[PDB]
């Protein structure tokens, strides 16, 4: 078996959702911001948000909504986790003591159902009579909000429309009414039903079905003065309400998909709309009052306000303040002004909240020679792309390097005192036949530049037609200075060439240090790329020189330096190249028993391969023979997102389901079959998407002073900006910390009353297993925050099993020291 | 695709056994003794009739590729029955086959098994499988005797007498190389043909074509009377060489 | 000739890797040196010496040289390790069963979470599977371990049934003692949970119906670790075993011993309301508690869902 320890170095920074209401007091306006597994509560002031409380939950926050049922003084909070843990929460404050009350809770998972494409949707009735949940295709789940439903029991109503895009409860109906857009073979439609708690079924809805735009994306519930709904698409915005129908199709919204909306005026007159290119729009509802006294919707208008970060969620606060919640870039507070500035913009940024964004790749480098190590991360996407330099100093110091284009891979080349970074920028087919970039960015603002002139694929004779307005990716290699972080050089790869892999190394007997890039020719027609290059570059005297190119028959997804040789994965093949005295790559040997060799890691003569659907394989280079040999494979099927080698026998992997596992050589030589079987010894639900594993640590350890029990250091970056650390334990230390977790889980009160053991259980749609081999360090590190009475309760009847102290009963102060030592690894 | 398992009578003059100086009478005796050994041993173990026959067919085919002077027959027989049990889903442990073989064979005969009987048998399985070319599925005259007779309608007692007499003839033919000359279907009609002659029954009357004198032709097409008689001659020869009489 | 198996040496294949671990050996992927065809080699270790050649392999060699069908896996030949020329006794070399190579297995396409099946894809999949099962069931063979792992899929959309290690013949005239623990619990029929031991070809139909549901939910329908727990889960959806819906349930050994918590009503149509009607009828008939009332393979092929499907339009699963 294996024993490992996992802790968070940086908590998730991406904003998954944001709501505003009256949660902490019936009087204050609060902004609740949801990051993965983290809930942040702020109090809205006119100068700026005031932080009041932060809690963690043992689950990914999927739905977050505030409601105030009749009889309550203040808003209550509904949350549903991605594992279907539901709960209703209340803020309660006793002077200085702030706590979160779990008013109702339960798990709403169905034994039989198909998870929907557009994900979990949660909405609440305007009269707070029920919570609507869309979890599975063909089913609508109703949790009625009666006082007695403390377990959140619910029932399912059969839904004929299997493919639902979005749903909202409508305002101003005689009965609870849902409005939704659905897709069937005839296109997309908008339809209504009434929800009957008494009959537990749908009744005919207030207005008839209307055919809508093919890419109708979002449904807006319009408040009582108007009533009805607005439907946002790619090209058009429409309003529906019984007999009334409006449509505005301003060409400005066609350029970029609109992804988020928020109501500004409670009456419903103004809405904020945001799009993927970061534009902020005002949607205006122009009113007309008849002599009858009735208020009708005359027309719709859209006005561009300015530019914000690419926002997953928008919330208007007060005055002109809007919270721009970003998952791809930095979250922001922006001021909306009545008068435009001299550039024509009405938006003026106030504060910028750091988001490590998606961490596509990262490397650890000791820039200042301080025997520490700093983390340079490829963070963000599109106009939010950046390079983030992170060091420890008690908070983490982060320096932001903007790129305004997507960073894909980073590697450090010390000889050249610079980083190599692979990037891609979006251009659009224009009337010239070429393409035009939407904004200047790193690859275009380089001091010196070059473009590949390779003739390898030039024979073409394969037609790829272009339509005006279509997007393309343009890939580059950026040479960036390690001190100024100034783009010294940018190399642009071929048209339709994707840069996928990057390494910096010396090969063979060649003393020169090269940048080597692996590419794939990507054409929309192809299911899998069938052409590719391995390109050797030399960065010398401010210019990048092309040294050699090797054509391959596939995508070079990953490369790694291997004992002076170049190990590269081309689709199914894993290949080892030698670097000749003629400065060309020469193939030595290949391995073909792979579906897609997405990831490669090496140690000694051993190679770890990560496959799209076959988990991990341990290969070895047999130098006596000049070939490869399969040492061991993990036969359990998993889809890999990243891999890392922990030691000669243990191997770490990350699943696309937000899970971690460790595989080991079965070390039993009785049969060959045992050695070929890697036994999954560790299973752990992380809750984050790990893109990059990287050996290193951010703390400045001489290791001459007391070394912590943990041994080894692997850092990992995730999609939600979370940075974590994995380290190994001895059998003695694992059992102590494990026995302690079980004790801590009995003592600590969870938000939503979510069992900790459930949360960390390995979870795919198909399987659920109890965690094994992993210590939730974030649980262990919470011992230092529980009350002194609670601490003593945890340490009762505890004995050790360490050989120095045969059996050692614990005191609270003894364990306070053990955990404090563990907090020093990060 | 599939191997050919049938030879001509003339070809049996050239088995390995014959060419190593064994005369025709001796090889025939060895075949009867080995087959009857398989039969008696399996009967002691309670084995289905198909399992006995399959072992016997494996045995007869084996000695079309090897000589009796280099492969002791009772070891081969025991191995055939052992494999046949697994093929036909009536498995037996090798030790139990040896136990029974010890009871039935005298000390000279059980000498063939050598110092370690189980080992000599288990070792042979590799050669047996390679020899029979991994073609394990075998059909036997019994199923056709029953399938064909089910289509006879008439005196219940005369037909049952026909079936049992023919069934006896099938059991006796396993001691011969007929398994190597003719497909089971021809053997089944032949045993029906012989019993009908011996009981003075006219089978055509019981067929759906009562004026079709060649009744076999609806069951097995293209079977000459010569083939059916050659088989009969060979079966009754066992009854004239030994001192038992046509049933 | 092509028929003289057991002699050709495994030298004739370049081993590419180990695709899986089998019951009697480890399964390797190999390229034929002469033709270039990719094959799958199953290693048979006879070195065990306790009972010689494994009977699980004997069943697969006996049955798969008889069965010819597009949806039944094909055994191309049997090859051997370099044998010892001097002595036949010393030789312990193993034997390899050559099969056609298949790109993936259904469990893998599903466990990795990558594949999305449309109705038409499920039609082309089930039509091939049931057609193969009919060929086998008409030849009086029982598969006896139908699982997602044992359904091999090509990228083109061809399906082949594969692991015939527990396959045996069925006789209507003679009820025979069989092993009452054949199909894996998730796909095991209710009849065998109560231990029938004398079962119909319907055992395999139940499994294929479980797969039909799993193709629509992307999650296995009846997942449990204990035989009683499975009976309860099946009972919740298909209804509790009772004399009215399954008259002869009383003749089953464990009917009094094994009991669901309640006598649950059948809710199959309700819980699978999202499944198309043409398919839902198939599922209700395939997941029928009573083996004598459970539909046959042929009846599934003459169903509104699968009858008018064209195998020429083998629409590939979305990959
Ligand atoms: C033991 O049953 C069998 C399973 C089989 N699975 C596959 C799928 N592979 C595709 C390539 C790879 S790389 C690692 C795992 C995988 C699975 N392909 C086969 O040809 C095959 C043949 C079999 O028996 C004859």
Query: Strand, helix or coil at A785?
Result: helix
- Tokens standing for A682? 């560790």
Quick one: closest CA in C to A114, which residue? C217
Least Cα distance to C145 among C153, C157, C133, C154 occurs for C133
CB B86 within 8 A of CB B47: no
Q: Name which of A404, A120, A436 is nearest A278 in CA terms.
A: A404
> Is C294's C-beta closer than 6 angstroms to any atom of ligand 1?
no
Q: Are B194 and B235 in contact (CB under 8 A)?
A: yes
Is the C-alpha dihedral spanning A340, A342, A345, A346 positive or negative? Answer: negative
The conformation of residue A116, written as its DSSP 8-state character, comes to -
Contact C58, C73 (CB under 8 A): no
What span, in angstroms and rounded, lies between the C-alpha atoms of A552 and A457?
11
Burial tier of A318 (Cβ tally within 10 Å: 0-12, 13-18, 19+) = exposed
3-state secondary structure of A261: strand
Q: Do C273 and A136 touch (CB under 8 A)?
A: no
| Domain regions of chain C by residue span | 10-100, 104-303
Q: Which positions ≥6 away from B236 have C-beta within 8 Å?
A: B194, B246
Q: How far apart are CA A379 and CA A356, in angstroms?
A: 6
User: Which residues does A374 contact at the CB level (< 8 Å), separation at least 6?
Assistant: A364, A365, A366, A367, A368, A389, A390, A391, A698
Tell me, yes or no, if C2 comes closer than 8 A to chain B by beta carbon. Answer: yes
Q: Which residues of A485-514 are buried (b: 16+ CB within 10 A; e: fewer)?
A: bebbbbbbbbebbbbbbbbbbebbebeebb
Nearest to A326, CA basis, from A312, A308, A342, A347:
A312
Q: Which CATH superfamily is domain B1-137 in?
A: Cyclin-like (1.10.472.10)
CA distances from B77 to B15, B42, B59, B99 (A): 18, 11, 6, 14
Catalytic residue among C11, C32, C81, C145: C145
Active site annotation includes C204: no
Out of C88, C95, C168, closest to residue B127 by CB: C88
Torsion, Cα of B231, B237, B242, B244 (10° steps):
70
SS3 for A741? helix
CB contact under 8 A, B87 and C62: yes
C-alpha dihedral sign at A240, A246, A249, A252: negative
Dihedral sign for Cα B179, B185, B187, B188, please.
positive
The dihedral region occupied by C78, where left means phi > 0, alpha psi between -120 and 50, and beta the remainder, is beta
> Do C144 and C167 contact (CB within 8 A), yes or no?
yes
How far is Cα A608 from Cα A602, in angstroms, rounded to an integer? 6
Order of strands across the sheet that contains A573-579: A556-562, A565-570, A573-579, A585-591
Question: Where are the domains positioned within chain B?
Answer: 1-137, 138-247
- What is the H or E stretch that residue A464 is in? none
**Phi/psi of residue C9, each to 5°?**
-90, 150
Assess contact for A739 and A729: CB atoms under 8 A.
no
In the block, tokens 């031991």 appear at C197
Q: Do C62 and B137 touch (CB under 8 A)?
A: yes
- Cα distances from A44 to residues A39, A97, B148, B192, in angstroms, run 16, 20, 95, 103
Tell me the CA–centroid distance for residue C100 and ligand 1, in Å.
Answer: 10
CB-CB neighbours of B69 under 10 Å: 12
Nearest residue to A482 (alpha-carbon basis) of A419, A421, A422, A544: A419
Q: Edge-to-edge strands of the sheet including A597-603?
A: A597-603, A606-611, A616-622, A627-633
> Which atom in ligand 1 lies closest to the alpha carbon of residue C73?
25
Residue A69 and residue A101 in contact, taking contact as beta carbons nearer than 8 Å: no
Contact criterion met (CB < 8 Å) for C91 and B126: yes
Alpha carbon distance A122, A59 (integer Å): 16
Q: Is A709 helix (H, G, I), strand (E, B) or coil?
A: coil
Structure-block tokens of residue A88:
């209703």
b/e per residue A757-794 (b: at least 16 CB within 10 A): ebbbbbbbebbeeebbbbbbbebbbebeebeeeebeeb
Ligand 1 pocket residue status of C278, Cβ below 6 Å:
no
Q: Matching CATH topology for B1-137 and B138-247?
A: yes
User: Subunits touching C (CB < 8 Å, at least 3 pairs)?
Assistant: A, B
Query: In terms of C-beta distances under 8 Å and separation of at least 24 residues, what long-range contacts does A322-326 make, across chains too?
Result: A322/A262, A322/A272, A322/A280, A323/A18, A323/A31, A323/A33, A323/A49, A324/A274, A324/A280, A325/A15, A325/A17, A325/A18, A325/A33, A326/A14, A326/A15, A326/A355, A326/A357, A326/A384
Q: Assess whether the C-beta atom of C75 lies below 6 angstroms from ligand 1.
A: no
Tell me, using a 6 A CB cutoff, whether residue C20 lines ligand 1.
Answer: yes
Q: Best of C17, C24, C29, C77 to mutate for ligand 1, by most ligand atoms within 8 A of CB?
A: C29
Q: Report whether residue A392 contacts ligand 1, using a CB cutoff of 6 Å.
A: no
**Two structure tokens written together for A783:** 């011992």
Q: What is the rounded CA–CA span in Å between residue A93 and residue A87?
A: 19
Check if C105 has its Cβ closer than 6 Å to any atom of ligand 1: yes
Q: What is the DSSP string of chain C?
A: -TT-TT-SBGGGEEEEEEEEE-SSSEEEEEEETTT--EEEEEEE--TT-SSSS-HHHHHHHHHHTT---TTB--EEEEEEPPP-SS-SSS----EEEEEE--SEEHHHHHHTT--B--HHHHHHHHHHHHHHHHHHHHTTEE-----GGGEEE-TTS-EEE---TT-EE--SSS-----S--S-GGG--HHHHTT-SS--THHHHHHHHHHHHHHHHSS-SS--SSHHHHHHHHHHHH----TTTSGGGGGSTTTTTS--SS-PPP-HHHHTTTS-HHHHHHHHHHT-SSTTTS--HHHHHTSTTTTT--SSS-PPPB-
Place of tokens 């030789």: C91
For residue A382, the Cα-to-chain-centroid distance in whole angstroms is 15
Whole-angstrom distance, CA of residue A782 vs CA of residue C167: 56
CA dist A252 and A459 (Å) reads 40
Q: How far apart are CA A27 and CA C273, in angstroms?
A: 46
Q: Which residues of C are annotated as a binding site?
A: 19-27, 42, 100-105
User: Alpha-carbon distance A157 to A200, whole Å?
Assistant: 7
Residues with Cβ within 8 Å of residue A294, at least 6 apart in sequence:
none
CB A250 within 8 A of CB A236: no
Annotated binding site of C for ATP: 19-27, 42, 100-105
CA angle B94, B100, B101 (to 5 degrees): 85
Using an 8 Å Cβ cutoff, are A336 and A347 in contact? yes
The angle, 0 to 180 degrees and rounded to 10, between the axes of the packed helices B94-104 and B117-131 is 110
Q: Of B50, B66, B56, B53, nearest to B35 (Cα)?
A: B56
Over the range C5-19, which residues count as b (16 or more CB within 10 Å of their CB) and which as e? bbeeebeebeebbbb
Element (DSSP H or E) covering residue A742: helix A731-747
Q: What is the DSSP letter of A115?
A: B
A166: closest CA among A248, A230, A79? A230
Chain-centroid distance of CA C277 in Å reads 26
**Domain B138-247 sits in CATH 1.10.472.10:** yes
Q: CB of A559 within 8 A of CB of A534? A: yes
Residues of A in contact with C216 (CB under 8 A): 114
- CATH 3.30.200.20 assigned to domain C10-100? The reply is yes
For domain C104-303, the CATH class is mainly alpha
CB contact under 8 A, C220 and A766: yes
Chain position carrying tokens 């005191």 = A811
Q: Do chains B and C touch (3 or more CB pairs under 8 A)?
A: yes
Q: Do chains A and C touch (3 or more CB pairs under 8 A)?
A: yes
Name the residue among A353, A399, A364, A327 with its Cα closest to residue A826: A364
Distances (CA, A) of A591 to A147, A369, A613, B29: 64, 40, 17, 59
Q: Give the number of residues written for chain C.
A: 319
Q: What residues pair up with A408 in beta bridges, in sequence order? A: none
Question: CA-to-CA distance for C292 and C309, rounded, in angstroms?
Answer: 27
> What distance in Å separates the CA atoms of residue B181 and residue B189, rounded to the nearest whole number?
15
Q: How many CB atoms lie within 10 A of CB A201?
A: 12
Resolution (Å) of this entry = 3.3
Q: Is A73 helix (H, G, I), strand (E, B) or coil?
A: coil
Query: Alpha helix locations (H) across A575-662?
Result: none
CB-based contact B144:B188 (threshold 8 Å): yes
DSSP state at residue A395: -
Instruction: Supply the Cα-derived Rg of chain C in whole angstroms.
Output: 21
What residues have CB less than 8 Å from A434, skipping those under 6 apart? none
Q: β-strand A690-695 against A678-685: which pairing, if any? A: unpaired
Domains (range + CATH), chain A: 4-353 (2.130.10.10), 359-728 (2.130.10.10), 731-823 (1.10.150.910)
């Amino acid at each position: 078996m294996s024993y490992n320890y996992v802790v968070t170095a940086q908590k998730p920074t991406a904003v998954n959702g944001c709501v505003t209401g009256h949660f902490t007091s019936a009087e204050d306006l609060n902004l609740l911001i949801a990051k993965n597994t983290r809930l942040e509560i702020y109090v809205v002031t006119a100068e700026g948000l005031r932080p009041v409380k932060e809690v963690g939950m043992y689950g990914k926050i999927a739905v977050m909504e505030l409601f105030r049922p009749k009889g309550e003084s203040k808003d209550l909070l509904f949350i549903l986790t991605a594992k279907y843990n539901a709960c209703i929460l209340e803020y309660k404050q006793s002077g200085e003591s702030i706590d979160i009350i779990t008013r109702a809770h339960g798990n709403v998972q169905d034994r039989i159902g198909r998870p929907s494409e557009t994900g979990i949707i949660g909405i609440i009735d305007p009269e707070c009579r029920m919570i609507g949940l869309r979890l599975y295709d063909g089913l609508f789940k109703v949790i009625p909000l009666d006082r007695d439903n403390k377990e959140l029991k619910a029932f399912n109503i059969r839904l004929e429309e299997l493919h639902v895009i979005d749903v909202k409860f409508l305002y101003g109906c005689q009965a609870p009414t849902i409005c939704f857009v659905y897709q069937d073979p005839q296109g997309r439609h908008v339809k209504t039903y009434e929800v009957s708690l008494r009959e537990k079924e749908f009744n005919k809805g207030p207005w008839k079905q209307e055919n809508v735009e093919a890419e109708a994306s979002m449904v807006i519930a319009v408040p009582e003065p108007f009533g009805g709904a607005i439907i946002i698409g790619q090209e058009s915005i429409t309003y529906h309400n019984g007999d009334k129908y409006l449509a505005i199709a301003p060409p400005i919204i066609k350029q970029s998909t609109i992804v988020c909306h928020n109501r500004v005026d409670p009456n419903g007159s103004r809405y904020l709309l945001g799009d993927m290119e970061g534009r902020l729009f005002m949607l205006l509802l122009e009113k007309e009052e008849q002599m009858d006294g009735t208020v009708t919707l005359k027309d719709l208008r859209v006005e561009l306000l300015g530019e914000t970060s690419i926002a997953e969620c928008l919330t208007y606060l007060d005055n002109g303040v809007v919270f721009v919640g970003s998952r791809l870039g930095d979250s922001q507070l922006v001021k909306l002004n009545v008068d435009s500035n001299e550039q024509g913009s009405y938006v003026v940024a106030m504060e910028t909240f750091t988001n490590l964004g998606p961490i596509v790749d990262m490397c650890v480098v000791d820039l200042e020679r301080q025997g520490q190590g700093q983390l340079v991360t490829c963070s963000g996407a599109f106009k939010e792309g950046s390079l983030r330099i992170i060091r420890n100093g008690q908070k983490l110091h982060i320096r932001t390097v903007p790129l305004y284009e997507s960073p894909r891979k980073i590697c450090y080349q010390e000889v050249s005192q610079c980083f190599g970074v692979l990037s891609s920028r979006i251009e659009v087919q224009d009337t010239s036949g070429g393409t035009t970039a939407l904004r200047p960015s790193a690859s275009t603002q380089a001091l010196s530049s070059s473009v590949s002139s390779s003739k390898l694929f030039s024979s073409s004779t394969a037609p790829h037609e272009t339509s005006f307005g279509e997007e393309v990716e343009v890939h580059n290699l950026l040479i960036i200075d390690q001190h100024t972080f100034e783009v010294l050089h940018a190399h642009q790869f071929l048209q339709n060439e994707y840069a996928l892999s990057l390494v910096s190394c010396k090969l063979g007997k060649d003393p020169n240090t090269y940048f080597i890039v692996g590419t794939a020719m990507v054409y929309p027609e192809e299911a899998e790329p069938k052409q590719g290059r391995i390109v050797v570059f030399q960065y010398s005297d401010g210019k990048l020189q092309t040294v050699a190119e090797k054509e391959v028959k596939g995508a070079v997804y990953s490369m790694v330096e291997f004992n002076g040789k170049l190990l590269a994965s081309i689709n199914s093949t894993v290949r080892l190249y030698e670097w000749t005295t003629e400065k060309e790559l020469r193939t030595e040997c290949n391995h073909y028993n792979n579906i897609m060799a997405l990831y490669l890691k090496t140690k000694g003569d051993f190679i770890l391969v990560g496959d799209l659907m076959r988990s991990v394989l341990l290969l070895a280079y047999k130098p006596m023979e000049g070939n490869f040999e399969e040492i061991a494979r993990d036969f359990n099927p998993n889809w890999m997102s990243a891999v890392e080698i922990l030691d000669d026998d243990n191997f770490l992997g990350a699943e696309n389901a937000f899970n971690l596992f460790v595989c080991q050589k079965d070390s039993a030589a009785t049969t060959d079959e045992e050695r070929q079987h890697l036994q999954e010894v560790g299973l752990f639900h992380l809750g984050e998407f790990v893109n990059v594993f990287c050996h290193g640590s951010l703390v400045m350890q001489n290791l001459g002073e007391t070394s912590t029990p943990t041994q080894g250091s692997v850092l990992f970056g995730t999609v939600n900006g979370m940075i974590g650390l994995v380290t190994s334990l001895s059998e003695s230390w694992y059992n102590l910390l494990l026995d302690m977790q079980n004790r801590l889980n009995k003592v600590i009160k969870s938000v939503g009353k979510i069992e900790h053991s459930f949360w960390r259980s390995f979870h795919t749609e198909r399987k659920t297993e109890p965690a094994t081999g992993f210590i939730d360090g974030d649980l262990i590190e919470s011992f230092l925050d529980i009350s002194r009475p609670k601490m003593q309760e945890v340490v009762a009847n505890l004995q050790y099993d360490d050989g120095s102290g045969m059996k050692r009963e614990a005191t609270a102060d003894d364990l306070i020291k053990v955990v404090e030592e563990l907090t020093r690894i990060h | 695709t599939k191997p050919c398992w049938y030879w001509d009578k003339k070809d049996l003059a050239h088995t390995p056994s014959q060419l190593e100086g064994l005369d025709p009478a001796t090889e025939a005796r060895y075949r009867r003794e080995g087959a009857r050994f398989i039969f008696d041993v399996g009967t002691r173990l309670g084995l289905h009739y198909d399992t006995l026959a399959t072992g016997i067919i494996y045995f007869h085919r084996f000695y079309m590729f090897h000589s009796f002077k280099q492969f002791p027959r009772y070891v081969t027989g025991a191995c055939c029955l052992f494999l046949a049990g697994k093929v036909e889903e009536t498995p037996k442990k090798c030790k139990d086959i040896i136990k029974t073989a010890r009871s039935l064979l005298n000390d000279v005969q059980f000498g063939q098994f050598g110092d370690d009987p189980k080992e000599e048998v288990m070792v042979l399985e590799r050669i047996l499988l390679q020899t029979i070319k991994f073609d394990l599925q075998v059909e036997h005259p019994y199923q056709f005797l029953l399938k064909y007779a089910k289509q006879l309608k008439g005196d219940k007692n005369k037909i049952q007498k026909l079936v049992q007499m023919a069934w006896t003839f099938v059991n006796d033919s396993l001691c011969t190389t007929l398994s190597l000359q003719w497909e089971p279907e021809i053997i089944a009609v032949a045993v029906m043909y012989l019993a009908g002659r011996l009981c003075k029954f006219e089978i055509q009357e019981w067929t759906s074509k009562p004026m079709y004198r060649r009744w076999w032709e609806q069951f097995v097409q293209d079977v000459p009377v010569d083939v059916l008689e050659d088989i009969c001659h060979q079966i009754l020869d066992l009854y004239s060489q030994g001192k038992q009489q046509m049933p | 000739t092509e028929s003289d198996w057991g002699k050709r040496c495994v030298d004739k294949f370049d081993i590419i890797g180990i695709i899986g671990e089998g019951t009697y050996g480890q399964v390797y992927k190999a390229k034929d040196k002469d033709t270039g065809e990719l094959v799958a080699l199953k290693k048979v270790r006879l070195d065990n010496e306790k009972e010689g050649f494994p009977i699980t392999a004997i069943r697969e060699i006996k049955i798969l040289r008889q069965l010819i069908h597009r949806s039944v896996v094909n055994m191309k030949e049997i090859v051997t390790d370099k044998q010892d020329a001097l002595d036949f006794k010393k030789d312990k070399g193993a034997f390899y069963l050559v099969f056609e190579y298949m790109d993936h297995d259904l469990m893998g396409l599903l466990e990795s979470g990558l594949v999305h099946f449309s109705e038409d894809h499920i039609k082309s999949f089930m039509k091939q599977l049931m057609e193969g099962l009919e060929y086998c069931h008409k030849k009086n063979f029982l598969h006896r371990d139908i699982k997602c792992s044992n359904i091999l899929l090509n990228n083109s959309g061809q399906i082949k049934l594969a692991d015939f290690g527990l396959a045996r013949l069925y006789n209507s005239e003679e009820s025979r003692p069989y092993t009452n623990k054949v199909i894996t619990l998730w796909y095991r029929p209710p009849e065998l949970l109560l231990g029938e031991e004398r079962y119909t070809p319907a055992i395999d139909v139940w499994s294929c119906g479980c797969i039909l549901g799993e193709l629509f939910t992307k999650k296995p329908i009846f997942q449990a670790n204990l035989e009683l727990a499975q009976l309860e889960l099946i009972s919740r959806l298909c209804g509790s075993p009772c004399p009215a819906v399954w008259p002869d349930v009383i003749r089953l050994p464990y009917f009094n011993t094994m009991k669901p918590k309640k006598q649950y009503r059948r809710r199959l149509r309700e819980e699978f309301s999202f499944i198309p009607s043409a398919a839902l009828d198939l599922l209700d008939h395939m997941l029928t508690l009573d083996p004598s009332k459970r539909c046959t393979a042929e009846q599934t092929l003459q169903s509104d869902f699968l009858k008018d499907v064209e195998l020429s339009k083998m629409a590939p699963p979305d990959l």
